Design a protein around this nucleic acid. Structure first.
Ligand SMILES: [Mg+2]
Ligand SMILES: [Mg+2]
Ligand SMILES: [Mg+2]
Ligand SMILES: [Mg+2]
Ligand SMILES: [Mg+2]
Ligand SMILES: [Mg+2]
Ligand SMILES: [Mg+2]
Ligand SMILES: [Mg+2]
Ligand SMILES: [Mg+2]
Ligand SMILES: [Mg+2]
Ligand SMILES: [Mg+2]
Ligand SMILES: [Mg+2]
Ligand SMILES: [Mg+2]
Ligand SMILES: [Mg+2]
Ligand SMILES: [Mg+2]
Ligand SMILES: [Mg+2]
Ligand SMILES: [Mg+2]
Ligand SMILES: [Mg+2]
Ligand SMILES: [Mg+2]
Ligand SMILES: [Mg+2]
Ligand SMILES: [Mg+2]
Ligand SMILES: [Mg+2]
Ligand SMILES: [Mg+2]
Ligand SMILES: [Mg+2]
Ligand SMILES: [Mg+2]
Lengths: 168, 185, 257
RNA sequence: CCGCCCGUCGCUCCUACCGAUUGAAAGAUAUGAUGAAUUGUUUGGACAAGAAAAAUUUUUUCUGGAAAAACCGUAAAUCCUAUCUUUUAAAGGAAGGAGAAGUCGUAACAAGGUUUCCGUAGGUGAACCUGCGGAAGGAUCAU
RNA sequence: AACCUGGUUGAUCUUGCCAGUAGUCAUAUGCUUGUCUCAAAGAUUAAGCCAUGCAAGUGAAAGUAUAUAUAUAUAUAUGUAGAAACUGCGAACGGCUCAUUAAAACAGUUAUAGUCUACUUGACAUUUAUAAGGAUAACUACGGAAAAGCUGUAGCUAAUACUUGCAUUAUCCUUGGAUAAGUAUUUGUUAGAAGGAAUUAUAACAAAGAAGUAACACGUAGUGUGUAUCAAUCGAGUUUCUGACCUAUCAGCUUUUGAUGUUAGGGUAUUGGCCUAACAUGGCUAUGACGGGUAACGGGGAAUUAGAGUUCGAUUCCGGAGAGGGAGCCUGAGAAAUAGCUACCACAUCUAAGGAAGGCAGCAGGCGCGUAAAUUACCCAAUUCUAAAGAAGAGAGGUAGUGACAAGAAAUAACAAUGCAAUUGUAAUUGGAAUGGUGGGAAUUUAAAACCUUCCCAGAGUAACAAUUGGAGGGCAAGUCUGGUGCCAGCAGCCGCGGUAAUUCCAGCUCCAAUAGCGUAUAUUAAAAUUGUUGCAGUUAAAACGCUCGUAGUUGAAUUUCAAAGAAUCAUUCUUUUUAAAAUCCGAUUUUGUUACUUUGAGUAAAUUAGAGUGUUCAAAGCAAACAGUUAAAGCAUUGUGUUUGAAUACUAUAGCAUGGAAUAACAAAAUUGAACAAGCU
RNA sequence: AAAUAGAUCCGUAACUUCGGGAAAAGGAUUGGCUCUGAGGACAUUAAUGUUAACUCAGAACUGAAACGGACAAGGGGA
């Protein structure tokens, strides 16, 4: 099937190689996982030493952090809005490592009713105008096609300005 | 797989097939020592050439060098044990002076002739080949056997030989039989 | 297929086993265990070629079936078990004790220690690990894990180990004046002390050793084994005491009939 | 010197060359057109078992699941076209080497009877002759 | 052993080739062959095609037994054995061949701080219980098909097969409190004994979370089987630097469709244009890129050589690749496996015509091809491997059979008396010793034969128990002998011989050479200083461009610390003291540019090679062996107990790691301008 | 009489007066619908606003496999 060897490439001078060896099965290249937004559905694939990795096929929730405070919460994913590789991937709503998504933000505001020692932080405004509608922008940080999960953090500061400007 | 036991050659051809003086010298030596072919002359020449090559290489080397000391002592001891140098000429320069008759003098055939014990050198060869000779309580029947120094006082007839105190051969006993049935008939 | 090989050919066996190039295409092919293949001998070699107790392979098997052979105080029945450097061997039926050592050549010998000396061995450290809960484990050349190591034990020095209980008795440091046995190329059984240590930054480290006849040699740091403090060794030694003479002097000595 | 020797022409044999025939055959590479088998996702749902009044029935739900389809891939094979490599046929044309007392002349070797050669151009059955410039390896180391 | 002869002429001295000479672990072939030891053998052409048989299995305490036998104690109990079958492990090792392959593979040197790893070894664990579940082989009964290692329906029954699940404490502040309530792995915020270097071991805080910690067997506190994570071991995948044959009548190549980089992802056991999207215009080359050829697998090595060199390496060991040609895939720790599966191309087997089944470059064996190559034998006794691991199996492997490939030793007489030539020879005649080859029988050897040694019996005179293959003009050792032929037949590597008196053709005799061996053909090395670095030649023998300029390449003047004074030595060798300067000890120690180059070390597979020791009866070999003793002294441990050994050393690029250095050579620093220091300064 | 024809993207021999031959020969694509990307000007401060006009690339869906749908429009080679 798909192989990861370099015997079919050209040399750095531009000359072509002669092949005298078949494919060896320790350069497998099996096809990609196109994880999409929906109800949970995860498969199993076995690696070399019978080491399992998990293929997500549909996810709609995960664990999301608030980096300023160091707190994590499980919450629901609403949509995908940006992707730096190509925007054909936000069109089909696929989840990959470095997406920008929108998540339900009620669990985070509710938790702020314990007001660990970051009690003089002065939350920045743009995050507050996001909180008003009940949705915020986050960045995925895991690899769903390898661990079967979708995790990420809330975007703040200059990164938030960058991604606001990119979406206009 | 192929076997791991190896082998080697023992002679070499003259490279000039019809040279008169070399041919005459070879006949000299063959007649004097009672040999069969030129191949025996050539095997002895091969051996002597190896010895001389080792001696030359050692001599070109530096004095009080470890390699020279070790290998020269070994070679000189081997030569004196073989009976080719002696007692007052062990100096690695007398190795280059060894000639063909010296080596050819140590054969069991020549030794059996020179110690009485045989009326000629052809007699000496035929006796060795017919199981009549011992070298120190071991019976040897090969005429190219080279006698070492401490083995040359132990050459003698064999205990199983009619010339060395045993029963007579197939001819004596048949003659004695015929005589017996002659005298008892 | 192309998986792990299982056969060993005779001319490709390590040369210090001293195997006959006739009589066979194969060699015993030691098993996996506490020692590397090239720094060890299989038990059949010890028990047939060296001690001459057995005539064939099947006789070694019949010896080992009856549980009378122990290495490091444990009975072993595997005909290709690896034995290795500082291990002790006990045979109940004969009441014998041995320790393997290198001679002044590069080959292993059984040294025939006494019963009292059969209760310990010397292990050299290869690395020290820190694991969960902050406990320290030392790994020895013997392929052995020692938990709760003393904080003053470092990577290259040696330790003395009880055999009935796997505990430590004392430890010997790796310094400029310590006594050493060398275990690899061009000098495999020499005993000297130490003269200096080099510590080249990105590459190997070279150390120098002086004999008791004031002869000096050098080697890599990885093939140096500490066997004593400045004065005396902590184990008995074979008859030459690790003193290697050159070929001229050796030939002169051998010529005493 | 009754020496030696040069070329065309006629005969026989052998080797290679050009050659109309859009000549022939066997391979290799690249583009294109079809395209067996099959990894992965989705669709599908013969029937297997659970949760429900019962008389050994219908309907609901969960779960597992064969045949068969679709799509993105990994892609044997076949065909058409275009090149490249090697081998090979042929009317006719034109060389070289070898052989045999052949025919015609006499260019070279002597100042060889017009000293011999080089480059270039033209002409003649043949060897060759003639023009322009050069050399001595000349038949003169000199008036 | 660092070597030369014949041939151009009427004769001479040269250049120059042709021929002669010797070797080949180098193939074929012709003639001939008595003994023993050793042992290559369908590579070359066709990685061409295959009938038949075999080539991988496995239970001696320890998973499952009313198939069924059997013993003892007395209907019961404890045991021994066990067709079938389920389950477990192996079958990815071994064996074969050389088609592909020219910066590829391979070799020496590196990295994994970018990874996976069964068996074996050591450490050692976390959020109904007097014992849980259902279902299936073997088996019984009813069947189908020409055929196949084909299988349908119904009824039973086990397990270390497939599943569910019980009970238990530890740490911080002489009771309690908090509980810890989670091994690997993933995400976010932090702190931080070792390595040259950490985003490293490790610790805290907030979210997820696999898989496990004995519902098992033996009867030895002991084992077997299984199990989370770490470490070791037997290995692999990638990866740094340097190293190949012929060709320029191959000079520009790569990039649309990945060529060279950047950013973000996907995928893999991990890194990587390995793949996808966006972006930039790069990357290699006369120091030979890109192509063509190879009757090219690489290496350890082989042949021949004074020293340089030239040629070979299919083939004992290591690495690579393949199983008629290609491409896919399952199981598994490990495979892109082929005596595993799926499809196409080619070839081919059985058939009742519907269908089924194939892969000798494994061991024997057959056809074809050709100049070119052996038995359809015996055994697991040795060397090792696999298993439920003494006990089974193995065409791996060993043993014989065939065998003038190659290698070593070695018969075909010897001795007397007489006679005859010069003490001698034997040319000649007589007679008695010696001895294998050969036939028979044994002791041994061997799994069992067989061979070798050893012993007994019979056994040589034309010792018919009968040696050959090439030659006799020269090179080149050996007839001017006798018949036949007559420029014919023929010989002759080269010069030549043969036309009626042939030293050369055909024969007889006689001589020479090597000899159980000797000729012939093709290739290759020396000879060849006729490929020349060492080491050729260029006026007239083959050969200086018509002439000058010019880039790459090759090669380049002299100069910077030179000396002095002792000792130990048969003029000499080896060394001991230091005469400028600056920076580390209140005038004492040591430091003072880089390379090339040379010295010394480290590290390295054996076989082959060089070389030390050792009477295989010698030798080629091998890696062994030696010493006292009609059965003991003696020694060292208290009646015990044999002793001393050997299997060395060197070599292993030209590149890489470390190291002393004064000569030679290169490079650095070196002014239409540059430093150092003292004292007020921010 | 028939067959070919428009545009776009590839690929093009002999021979040659070196300008050609050449549209040589040959091959692939083309509708509709929903989207993505790239090409300007002006005025207040690397930010902010106000505004055009036609072209050219790429992707997903869709249909009795059709799309220069009628019109228009070279046959080629030795
Ligand atoms: Mg394979
Ligand atoms: Mg054995
Ligand atoms: Mg004239
Ligand atoms: Mg002449
Ligand atoms: Mg193999
Ligand atoms: Mg792209
Ligand atoms: Mg090879
Ligand atoms: Mg071949
Ligand atoms: Mg073979
Ligand atoms: Mg191999
Ligand atoms: Mg075949
Ligand atoms: Mg295959
Ligand atoms: Mg087969
Ligand atoms: Mg097949
Ligand atoms: Mg065969
Ligand atoms: Mg043959
Ligand atoms: Mg057992
Ligand atoms: Mg048996
Ligand atoms: Mg004659
Ligand atoms: Mg030559
Ligand atoms: Mg030469
Ligand atoms: Mg020479
Ligand atoms: Mg010359
Ligand atoms: Mg000139
Ligand atoms: Mg035209």
């Amino acid at each position: 099937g798909i192989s990861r060897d370099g015997r079919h490439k050209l040399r750095l001078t531009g000359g072509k190689k002669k092949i005298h060896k078949k494919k060896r099965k320790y350069e497998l290249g099996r096809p990609p996982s196109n994880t999409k937004l929906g109800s949970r559905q995860v498969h199993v694939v076995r690696g070399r030493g019978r080491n399992y990795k998990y293929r997500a096929i549909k996810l709609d929730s995960g664990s999301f952090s608030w980096p300023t405070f160091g707190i994590s919460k499980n919450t629901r994913i609403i949509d995908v809005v940006y992707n730096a590789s190509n925007n054909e991937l936000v069109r089909t709503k696929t989840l990959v490592k470095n997406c920008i998504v929108v998540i339900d933000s009620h669990p985070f505001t509710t938790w702020y009713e314990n007001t660990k020692i970051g009690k003089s932080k002065n939350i920045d405004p743009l995050l507050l105008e996001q909180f008003k509608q009940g949705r915020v922008l986050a960045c995925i940080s895991s690899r769903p096609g390898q661990c079967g999960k979708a995790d990420g953090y809330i975007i703040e500061g200059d990164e938030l300005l960058f991604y606001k400007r990119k979406m206009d | 797989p192929k076997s791991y036991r190896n082998y080697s050659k023992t002679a070499r051809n003259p490279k000039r097939p019809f040279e008169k003086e070399r041919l005459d010298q070879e006949l000299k030596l063959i007649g004097e020592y009672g040999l069969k072919n030129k191949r025996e002359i050539w095997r002895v020449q091969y051996l002597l050439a190896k010895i001389r090559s080792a001696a030359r290489y050692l001599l070109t080397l530096d004095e009080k060098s470890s390699k020279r000391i070790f290998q020269g002592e070994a070679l000189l001891r081997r030569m004196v044990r073989q009976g080719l140098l002696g007692e007052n000429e062990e100096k690695l320069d007398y190795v280059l002076g060894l000639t063909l008759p010296k080596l050819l003098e140590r054969r069991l055939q020549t030794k059996v002739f020179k110690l009485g014990l045989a009326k000629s050198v052809h007699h000496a060869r035929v006796l060795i080949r017919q199981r009549h000779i011992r070298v120190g309580k071991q019976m040897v029947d090969i005429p190219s056997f080279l006698v070492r120094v401490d083995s040359e006082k132990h050459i003698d007839f064999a205990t199983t030989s009619p010339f060395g105190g045993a029963r007579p051969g197939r001819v004596k006993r048949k003659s004695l039989k015929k005589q017996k049935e002659k005298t008892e008939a | 297929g192309k998986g792990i090989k299982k056969h060993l050919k005779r001319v490709n066996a390590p040369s210090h086993w001293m195997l006959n190039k006739m009589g066979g295409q194969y060699a015993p092919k030691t098993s996996s265990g506490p020692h590397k293949l090239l720094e060890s001998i299989p038990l059949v070699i010890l028990l047939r070629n060296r001690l001459k107790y057995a005539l064939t392979f099947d006789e070694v098997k019949m010896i080992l079936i009856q549980k009378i052979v122990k290495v490091d105080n444990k009975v072993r029945t595997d005909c290709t078990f690896p034995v290795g450097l500082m291990d002790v061997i006990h045979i109940t039926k004969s009441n014998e004790y041995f320790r393997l050592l290198y001679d002044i050549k590069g080959r292993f010998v059984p040294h025939r220690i006494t019963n009292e000396e059969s209760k310990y061995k010397l292990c050299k450290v290869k690395k020290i690990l820190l694991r969960k809960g902050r406990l320290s484990i030392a790994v020895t050349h013997d392929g052995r894990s020692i938990p709760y190591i003393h904080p003053d034990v470092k990577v290259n020095d040696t330790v003395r180990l009880d055999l009935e209980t796997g505990k430590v008795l004392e430890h010997l440091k790796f310094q400029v004046g310590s006594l050493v046995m060398v275990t690899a190329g061009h000098s495999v059984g020499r005993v000297g002390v130490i003269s200096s240590i080099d510590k080249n930054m990105g590459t190997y480290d070279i150390i120098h050793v002086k004999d008791s006849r004031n002869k000096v040699f050098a080697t890599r740091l990885s093939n140096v084994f500490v066997i004593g403090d400045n004065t005396k060794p902590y184990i008995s030694l074979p008859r030459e005491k690790g003193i290697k003479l050159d070929i001229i002097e050796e030939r002169r000595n051998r010529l005493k009939a």
